[PDB]
Amino acid sequence: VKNSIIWFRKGLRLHDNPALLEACKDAKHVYPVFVLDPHFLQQKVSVNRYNFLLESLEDLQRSFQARGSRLLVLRGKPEEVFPRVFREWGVTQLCFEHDTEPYAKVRDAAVRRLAAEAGVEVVTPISHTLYDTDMLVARNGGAAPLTMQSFTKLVDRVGDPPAPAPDPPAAMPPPAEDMPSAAPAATGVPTWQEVGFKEPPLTVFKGGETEALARLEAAFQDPKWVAGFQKPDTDPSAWEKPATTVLSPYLKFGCLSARLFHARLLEVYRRHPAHSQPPVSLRGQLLWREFFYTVGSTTPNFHRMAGNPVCKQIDWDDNPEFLAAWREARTGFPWIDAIMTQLVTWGWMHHLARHSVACFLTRGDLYVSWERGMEVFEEHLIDQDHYLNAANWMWLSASAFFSQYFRVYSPVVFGKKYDPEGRFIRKFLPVLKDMPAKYIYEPWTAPLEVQRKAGCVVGRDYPAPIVDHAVASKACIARMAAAYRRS
Ligand SMILES: Cc1cc2nc3c(=O)[nH]c(=O)nc-3n(C[C@H](O)[C@H](O)[C@H](O)COP(=O)(O)OP(=O)(O)OC[C@H]3O[C@@H](n4cnc5c(N)ncnc54)[C@H](O)[C@@H]3O)c2cc1C
Ligand SMILES: [Cl-]
Numbered sequence: 371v372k373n374s375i376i377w378f379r380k381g382l383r384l385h386d387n388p389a390l391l392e393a394c395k396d397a398k399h400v401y402p403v404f405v406l407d408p409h410f411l412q413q414k415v416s417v418n419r420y421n422f423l424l425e426s427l428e429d430l431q432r433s434f435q436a437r438g439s440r441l442l443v444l445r446g447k448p449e450e451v452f453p454r455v456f457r458e459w460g461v462t463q464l465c466f467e468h469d470t471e472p473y474a475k476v477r478d479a480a481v482r483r484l485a486a487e488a489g490v491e492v493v494t495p496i497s498h499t500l501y502d503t504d505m506l507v508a509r510n511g512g513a514a515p516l517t518m519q520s521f522t523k524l525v526d527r528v529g530d531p532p533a534p535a536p537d538p539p540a541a542m543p544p545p546a547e548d549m550p551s552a553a554p555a556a557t558g559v560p561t562w563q564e565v566g567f568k569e570p571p572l573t574v575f576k577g578g579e580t581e582a583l584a585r586l587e588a589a590f591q592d593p594k595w596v597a598g599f600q601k602p603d604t605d606p607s608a609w610e611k612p613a614t615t616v617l618s619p620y621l622k623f624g625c626l627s628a629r630l631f632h633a634r635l636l637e638v639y640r641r642h643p644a645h646s647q648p649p650v651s652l653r654g655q656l657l658w659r660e661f662f663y664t665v666g667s668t669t670p671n672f673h674r675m676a677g678n679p680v681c682k683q684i685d686w687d688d689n690p691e692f693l694a695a696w697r698e699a700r701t702g703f704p705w706i707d708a709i710m711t712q713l714v715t716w717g718w719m720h721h722l723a724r725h726s727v728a729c730f731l732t733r734g735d736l737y738v739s740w741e742r743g744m745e746v747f748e749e750h751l752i753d754q755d756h757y758l759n760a761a762n763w764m765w766l767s768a769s770a771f772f773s774q775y776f777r778v779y780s781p782v783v784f785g786k787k788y789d790p791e792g793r794f795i796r797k798f799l800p801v802l803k804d805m806p807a808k809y810i811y812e813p814w815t816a817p818l819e820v821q822r823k824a825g826c827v828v829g830r831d832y833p834a835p836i837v838d839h840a841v842a843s844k845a846c847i848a849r850m851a852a853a854y855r856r857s
Contacts (some may be wrong), residue, residue, distance in 0.1 A: 371398040373459055373546070377439075377466035378404045378685060379474070382426045382725035383579040384433055386534035386627030388402040388495040389465040391709060398541045401436055401552070402441045403461055407450045411566040418717040419619075419752040422577040423563040426625055429578025439542040442557040449480045455551050456488040459532050467624070468496045470503060470667040471756050500531040500628050500656060503664045514665045515679070516771075521661045522648050528617055534630040572715045575619055582620035589615045590634060599652040606722035607789035609712070615652070616718060618753035621659070632656060659758060666757035673760045675741060675769070682769045684853055686732075686739035693738050695836050696731050697746050700826075702835030704802055705797045705811055706730050707783040711798040717752035728766035729779045733850050735792050740767035768850060775850040778843045782811050 374393040382404075394400055404427060409768035410420075434852035444451045444786045455461065464485050469478065478494070485492050486574040496502050506524055507514050515521035545552050562571065575581075590596055620626040629820035635653045639645045648654030675684075695701050709723045719727075724747075728737065740763040747763070748754045751783055764770040785794065792810035796803045802810060804824040810815035814828045814835060821827045828834050 371460075372396050373399045374465060375455070375459070375461055376403045376465040377464065377770055378430065379400065379466060379469060379621065380622075381467040381624035382430055383536050383582070383627065383731040384430075385579070385583075386497060386630050387467075387469050387538065388497055388535045389493065391535060392493050392495070393465040394542055397463075397543045399459070399546045400439060401440060401455070401461075401545050402430070403444055403449060403455075404430075404441065404526070405444050405446065405453075407446050407447065408565070411439070414749055416433070416571075416714075416717065416750045416752075417562050417567040417569060418573045418750065419694060419754065420565065420567065420754045421571045422573070422575070422619060422717075423623060423785055423795065424559060424562060424565075425577035426579070426623055429580050429625075433579070434542065434753065437538070437540060437542045439544050440554075440557075441559070441561055442545070442552055444557065445693075446549070448483065451551075452481055453484050455483070456490055458551055459546065459549060460740065461490050462490070463491045463493065463790060465493045465495075466803055467498055468494045469498065469619070474835055497627070497629070498624060499527065499663050500660045501525065503660075503667050505789060506664055514668050515661070516665065518649050518661055519657070521664070522650045522654075522657060523704060525660070530636070531629050531632055532632055534627050543617065555604060575616065575716070575718060575752065577619070577625065577840050579620075579625045582617070582626035585615070585617060586626060586631070586634070589617070590638065593638045596635065596638045597645035600646050600650040601655060601721065602650060604720065604722070606726070606790050607785055607794035608720070611793055612720065614720060618755075619718065622753045622755045628656060628659070628714050632807065659755075659840065660729065662761040663757050666760060671769045673744075673756060673766035675739070680770050681764055682853070682857060684739075684767070684769055685849070687737045689736065689738055693742050695833075696727070696736060696738070696743070700833045701781075701837075702814070702833045703730075703781040703811075704792070704799055704832075706781050710781045713747075713750045715798070717750055724780050725764070725766060726784055728763060730781050732763075732767035733775055733846055734778045735781070735837055735839060737846050737849065740764060740769060751762050760799065764826075773854070775847060775854070778847060782855040786811055799832075801832050 374389045374397045376393040381389070384390065396499050427441065427443065434441050450591055482492050506528065509528060510524055515524055614616065617626055617631070621628060632653065646655055665676055666672040666679070667679065669680055675681050696710070699707040701707055706727055709727050712723070728743060731738050732740050743762045744759060747759055751759070761771060765772040768775040791807045795810055802813065804814065805813055806820065806824070807822065813821070813826065813832055828831050
């Protein structure tokens, strides 16, 4: 008889899950499995993203229970738990979604060899990205496109992505009863207290496939807002109702299908002939994700500078006093500190909000390496994607893809064009709630009586600016200008 395991890593969903459909096909027992390393906390990982993961597992648990099955959260290492459950459960087939990250290629190649020793068939369909990223490389001639213009031309030559897979049946084959490695007390979904986190999460974005689909339908209630979506024209200061979809945490963990997102967009574009085109359209945003996944998966040492063939070797400064002030949201610029506060509290910021803080830290003001600010992003971002977190930090630091280092955002003026009152600043930095809008972006310019009347004395309640932007940016641009000549 057929006993199969559907291994969940990414793709924490039931819709558009071809690895789950194959696992349930002609199966006597199906074992939904998610492997947890309990000593992750003892390695870097905020409670916001980890609890977002735990909520997505509880969402899978309720979905399997409604279909007569159950999710199994196995503790330990995968190269270790699988050889035991193969012989215990009488496994004949193992299915999981294809992953192109550097750690996964090592991990999955080890489980395949263990599955070959136990006589277990391995089926790894592709469903995390829009296309087969290795197929796009072969169709381009053996190398990945290095520009968005060339990559957009490539996917149009290939055509539409595969349609989202059918939904799984209403009744799934249950796991076998009285199996020791499937005991409910040792396979349940733990909370954030039991994994070792002492401070609770503060994000307002709840994980799970159900919330992802509800957040999808809400974005598609106005098809005219979807058809005319232009990314550079959105508001980074919009926090009550974010100007974009905020679907990145669900696309990272796989709670939402990229092919399902793509399909619904084409249904709206079909009825709106004047819809926006890449790279500014909503479809173009999924292409940015697909473009950076294709380049990073085929480029050695992509998340670093040394050994990276696409990254420029820049003479970044090793300044831990500027990195600390930027990391702890105490640079003295309320626009920068408010965004960094949203990073630690919500774990998500608007794309242009991530532009202002990444530019200020790197080529803009502080001239600190993009690898240092990345590690801060990989800790607090609930949507942190290995490949996407890289290319954008190399984009903002002018190390790759982007080479216009003369374009420097102003930490004082940038947020002013969207939010002259400073409503975004007063929310995440409540020490400046009473500061008048005239000095809310430059509090050090307010008279001392204005600082006292507002209860925000610069140097006592709110820090002074760590740098003069005019002097810092002028030096940073020039240093970046000679590095490009030596290139
Ligand atoms: C320094 C820096 C770091 C970043 N790190 C991450 C990261 O770790 N994870 C991440 O998902 N995005 C990252 N981005 C990209 C971008 O900021 C987010 O994808 C976007 O803010 C998500 O909001 P949204 O879901 O509303 O996107 P929308 O504008 O609604 O776009 C929809 C989807 O398209 C994709 N997308 C959008 N913009 C980009 C982009 N620039 N590059 C790649 N894919 C994109 C995402 O999957 C997103 O959910 C980073 C950008 C910068 C500048
Ligand atoms: Cl500006």
